[PDB]
């Protein structure tokens, strides 16, 4: 359809895993059109990271093996094999499930829509 102006679809503070650290960074994630963005705060007007929904892979990651009931999921961008430099998925984690379910839902949803007439 058409998507000129209106705003995002889903927004919330999500925890994104650092680059090469076992820490989580609580940032403000926003879902606008067919692209996932995330800002440090809800003040700035410039998106940090941008992930193409229409070409990503939402994989539900599980914490410990023993532990049960975890809402963790990482987003894998398109083209990832011949990159022996720097290209790690987007390890995102939500506080509550209902939250992770929605995010993923939307994320996966939009991601669903792609170049395929069937």
Pick from 25, 55, 61: nearest CA to 41: 25
- Cα–Cα distance between 106 and 112 in angstroms, integer? 9
110, burial (CB in 10 Å: exposed 0-12, middle 13-18, buried 19+): buried
Query: Which tokens sit at 63?
Result: 């914490």
**Measured at the alpha carbon of residue 13, what is the angle toward residues 108 and 79, in degrees to the nearest 5?**
40
The reply to whether CATH 3.40.710.10 applies to domain 1-118 is no
């Amino acid at each position: 359809g058409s998507s000129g102006s209106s705003g995002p679809i889903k927004m919330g503070w999500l925890k994104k895993q650092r680059s090469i650290v076992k820490n989580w960074q609580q940032r403000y994630f926003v879902l606008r059109a067919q692209q996932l963005y995330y800002y440090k705060d809800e003040e700035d007007t410039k998106p940090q990271g941008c992930m193409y929904l229409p070409g990503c892979t939402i994989k539900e990651i599980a914490t410990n093996p023993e532990e049960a009931g975890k809402f963790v999921f990482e987003i894998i961008p398109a083209s990832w094999d011949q990159n022996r430099m720097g290209q790690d998925s987007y390890v995102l984690m939500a506080s509550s499930q209902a939250e992770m379910e929605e995010w993923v839902k939307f994320l996966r949803r939009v991601a669903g829509s792609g170049p395929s007439s069937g």
